[PDB]
Each structure stands twice: as structure tokens, then as C-alpha cells.
Design a protein around this ligand. Sequence first.
Ligand SMILES: *[C@H](O)[C@H](CC(C)C)NC(=O)[C@H](CC(C)C)NC(=O)[C@H](CC(C)C)NC(=O)OCc1ccccc1
Ligand SMILES: *[C@H](O)[C@H](CC(C)C)NC(=O)[C@H](CC(C)C)NC(=O)[C@H](CC(C)C)NC(=O)OCc1ccccc1
Ligand SMILES: [Cl-]
Ligand SMILES: [Cl-]
Ligand SMILES: [Cl-]
Ligand code: NA
Ligand code: NA
Lengths: 305, 305
Amino acid sequence: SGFRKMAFPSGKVEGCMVQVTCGTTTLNGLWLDDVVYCPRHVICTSEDMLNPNYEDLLIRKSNHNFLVQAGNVQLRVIGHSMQNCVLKLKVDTANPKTPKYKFVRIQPGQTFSVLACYNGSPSGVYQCAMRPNFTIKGSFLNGSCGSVGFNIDYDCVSFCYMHHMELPTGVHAGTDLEGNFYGPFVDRQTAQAAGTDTTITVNVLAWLYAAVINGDRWFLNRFTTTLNDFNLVAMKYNYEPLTQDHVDILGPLSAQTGIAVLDMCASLKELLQNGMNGRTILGSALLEDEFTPFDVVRQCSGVTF
Amino acid sequence: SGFRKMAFPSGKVEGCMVQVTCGTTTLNGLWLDDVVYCPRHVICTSEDMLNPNYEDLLIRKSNHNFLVQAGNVQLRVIGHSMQNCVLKLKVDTANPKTPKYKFVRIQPGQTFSVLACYNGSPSGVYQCAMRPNFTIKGSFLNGSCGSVGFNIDYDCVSFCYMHHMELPTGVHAGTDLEGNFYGPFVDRQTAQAAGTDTTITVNVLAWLYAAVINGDRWFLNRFTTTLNDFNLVAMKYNYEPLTQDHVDILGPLSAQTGIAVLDMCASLKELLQNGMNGRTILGSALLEDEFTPFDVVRQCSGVTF
Ligand SMILES: *[C@H](O)[C@H](CC(C)C)NC(=O)[C@H](CC(C)C)NC(=O)[C@H](CC(C)C)NC(=O)OCc1ccccc1
Ligand SMILES: *[C@H](O)[C@H](CC(C)C)NC(=O)[C@H](CC(C)C)NC(=O)[C@H](CC(C)C)NC(=O)OCc1ccccc1
Ligand SMILES: [Cl-]
Ligand SMILES: [Cl-]
Ligand SMILES: [Cl-]
Ligand code: NA
Ligand code: NA
């Protein structure tokens, strides 16, 4: 038993990380098959970043302006192109460690693992959620750009996130691997703000099922609620609305524990209106919303890859 | 910026995990060079586990009673031996993925990454601390035994933990890679209890420095304290004593932030006596003690491997 914020094993991704240097700027790239993906702002100076014209900047660059280094090996760039906010550098050697992979755009609330890298080398791995305001609360320092987020499905790596910037609040923004930002953000150093973040209600309920599975039951109550009445309370505490689709996705956890989804909603309702009274749930004094229903099933049934 | 519970990249360890089957019992082994390490209770039946005589049980086993499977490859066992609570199976093939490694016994308070595995395959990776009562609060299901804990130092994997059992409280116990349990526990299914757990004071202070580095400063106060006076308060809240060695280890964080260690102790003192008043520190309503001082420096300076 036990319940931890668990990341995916990172070896399949570690074997894809490289270092991309253009001019004096160095960040990470993702080497799949014969293409290296990296944030396009690698082609900027420290001065360009206020409002760069990336089209113009890339036109002035030749293949040999991009230094791509896999470990100590030197990769030869034989082509370069821009797709939205990411650079695609064609190299002369396919990565022999290329896993089976897919590029996917995740939805707010879904979780993934981040392999935080500097200079093409891994620093650490951690799990996090795409917030409802399309930011993530990561741990990223200068040079971490080009670090990727991912999920694993049996043997297939689903890449969903490439890191590009930090907004003043310590919050992090990036793109999918097709180069489109999550949220309204742009890769230039002009003033930008994330907008209203809310709590991922379906994930909190998932985590309450996780607590029951692991023996924390004090919050189960005799009350029940309707879906609309629950959302009346949720909205007041800046929780995302719970939809019928969310109810369906919580179905299997409800079946495993024998606690109807609306009965668990009624328990959450009381927690929101009364607090925890200095009690804890899975060691936490706050309601946790970075576990999806599938994250709970995976970890509590021991799914492997 | 940002601060997350970060695990080490797990690829070097993933390449060492195998599946060991004896009779009907299957757990994980660690394949380094030409030796596979696994928990010795793999040689028990479901009935033996009450009070096995492992010496006797192993004597009745032949090399071919141990089925060792690396992926789909079948390893040949050519030798078997017992060191304390772990089995050492000699195989006919060195692991080609063997990293540079060391076996180390960590001390209470120190952190490591756990690569949770089933049937020799990774399920996930998470960071945790050796509690003062020599247990860990992990996430382990049946079949997870033989999963290992580890740290990385540049290129060297320091293996410190092999998982063996769960005590009734959902708490987890295991050995170092020489087979000796952390704590007073024994690998048989007789009644056992962990004993008094306490909060890892030096780690909480580390995490308060981490909060300052990341911009949370509301808890810094004008007060100061002596080391003995702080420990008078700490003991009352079941915090481990802070020693002069702990002060020295916090030195570099104190120098980076400009906050003397005893001034941070004074801030912790007020937090303990007054609570947080519904405030949070790095998103947490409770004081976090699973980060060592070096974990904070690593993550906040971007150390790589
Ligand atoms: C890439 O490694 C690096 C990672 C960060 C964690 C530092 N990203 C950048 O340097 C990035 C490059 C630009 C061209 C996309 N810039 C930022 O992320 C920048 C961070 C600095 C200012 C600390 N943030 C930024 O410009 O945010 C928009 C903004 C600007 C001005 C006022 C408010 C908000
Ligand atoms: C190995 O994969 C598995 C992992 C656990 C997470 C289930 N470990 C065991 O099966 C282990 C084998 C014994 C011989 C060391 N047994 C236990 O960990 C056992 C767990 C069961 C009872 C759920 N725990 C145990 O025996 O604890 C001691 C005990 C016994 C009786 C009363 C209180 C405490
Ligand atoms: Cl309804
Ligand atoms: Cl908390
Ligand atoms: Cl003193
Ligand atoms: Na209603
Ligand atoms: Na004193």
C-alpha cells in the first residue's frame, strides 16, 4: 500500500536528450529518429528576446550555426526548419535509442512526467499536472528549456510538453511538440500573465478514492448530493466544474471502493465547507489535485511498462 | 525557479532490474556484473513465512530452482549464496548495462529515489527519506520486493535500499544491499512495530531555505535563538535534535541566502508554536522534511549527472 507522487521511469527519454547551441545560447533538444526538436528562441540573442522576428532570424542562420551534441558525440545538422515555436534540426544520424513514441496535446488536468535537463543531461524527474490556466508548477532554471514532459503507455512514449519560459509568479509555460503553446503565451519577453487558476476537481476526487483504498476513511459521510448542487459549492471555492464525463471516468474507482461518485462529491463538499480540522488525508493537510483517476488506478494496481 | 520533490533519472537502474522466480514466488532482482541480488524470502512458501529457517531452506535449493529473467532473456544461475537477508545468485553472463555503482548504508534523514518494479519491470520512480525510525513511507504492492532505492553521484549509482516488507501502518521496511535491515525488523511474518517516528529537523530547515530561495519569505522574523533553546522546543513537537553537525551542513544554504542558521531556527520555532495561520510555504500547509540540505542545493543550482 501507500500513495506517492510517482513519475514514469525516464530511461527511454534520457536516451533522447541532446544539447543544442546556437551562438552563445545553449538549451536542450529532443533527438528522435533523424530530427532534433528544441525551442526556437535558441536562435535569439539576449537582446532579441524583447520582440524577435523568428522568421527573419532563422533565415540568417545556416545549418552549421547549430551545434548539436549527444553526450560527447557531435551530430551534423543537414537541415533546419521552424514549426510554430519549435526548431526542427535534421541530422545525419538517426538516434539508435529512439523509443516508440507519439506527440500528443494533453488537456488541462492531465498529468505527465518532466525530465529536467541542463546541457543535454538529466538533472531529475518529477510528476505534475497541466493546470486549468495552461501553466505548470515546475522546477526549472536557466538552461532548462527544451526539457520535455511525457507519459508512457506500455512501450510508447507520448511526448506532450517542451519547456520554454517562466512567468513572474514562478509558473512555467511551454508548448506541445508541434510547437504550439499551452495557453495564451508567446515566446518573447513581453509582459504576460497566466490568468485564473482553479483546482482540478476530478483529480481531487480521484485522490480521495486513493485515500480510501489506502485506509483513510474519516471523511466519508452519510450525506449525498446532486451533480448540479455539488458544482454550486465547487464554483464558490474556485474548483473546476465536474462534468458527467468526469463522473464516468471516476466510475472504475467508484466500483472498486463501493463509494458512488456523488457520495464522494458529498464528502468533498463537506471538506470544502468545514475544512479538515487539523486532520490529514494521505499525509496531506490540503486537497491534492495532481493525480488523475488513471494515475490512481495505475499506482494502486501496479501497472508496469 | 520552483521547488519539486525530484527523483533521480532512473535509466541506469532500469537496466539492472530482473525478475527472480523460486517456486511460485516472484519478486525483483538487481543484476550487477555477474550477480543478481534479491530478497531471500523468495525461497519461502506462503506457509514458511511465519518463522522460516532460511539456512535450512536455502540448503534444499539447487541452482536451477531459481528462474532469473532479464526481459525475455533467460539467465543461467551457476551459484547461489546468502548474505544476511539477501540472496546472491551467480549468473553466467555479466550485465552489459552495469553502471558504475557502490553499495552504501544511509543514515536516518537522508533521501533516495525508489524505482518501484513488478516482475522485473519499472512501474514508477519517486523520492523519499529514511525516517528516523528506519522505515520509509513508500508505495509498494505485492510483488514489489527487490525494488531498490538509490542516489546518483555524477556517474556512480549508490544503491542504499532493497524493499522487503510492509508493516501494518502502511509503512515500509527493507535492507541495504549487504542484506541488513534498516531498523529492528526481521524478514518473517511475526508481529513487529516501527517505533516512535519524529520529524527530520535539519531537512525542514533545508526546505525553509529552499522557500526563501524561491521567494517565500513571510516566516522570517526578527527573533533569534540559541541551539539548546531551539532543541527544547523541537523536542516538545517531536522533532529530532539539531546538532552542530547539522548546523555546519546547513552552512552553504545560510551563506547563499544571508540567513544565519540560528535565525532560521528561530523562524521554525515560531512556526511550531503558532502554526502557519492558514498560510502555505512552497504550496504546503505542513512543514516538509523529505529534502536534505544537499537536495536543495542540487535542485536550486541545477546539478546534472
Ligand atoms: C529557457 O531555458 C529559459 C527557462 C526559464 C526558466 C529561465 N527561458 C527563457 O529564458 C525565456 C526565453 C524567452 C525568449 C521565451 N524567457 C523567460 O522565460 C523569461 C524569464 C526571465 C524574465 C526570468 N520570462 C518572460 O519573459 O516572461 C514574460 C514576461 C516578461 C516581462 C514581464 C512579465 C512577464
Ligand atoms: C514482497 O514483494 C512483499 C511486499 C509487501 C509490500 C507486500 N513482502 C512480503 O510479502 C513480506 C514477506 C515477509 C516474509 C518478509 N511480508 C510482509 O511484508 C507482510 C505483509 C502482509 C502481512 C500484508 N508484513 C508482515 O509480515 O509484517 C510483520 C507483521 C506480522 C504480523 C502482524 C504485524 C506485523
Ligand atoms: Cl445528478
Ligand atoms: Cl499540506
Ligand atoms: Cl548556540
Ligand atoms: Na442544483
Ligand atoms: Na538553553
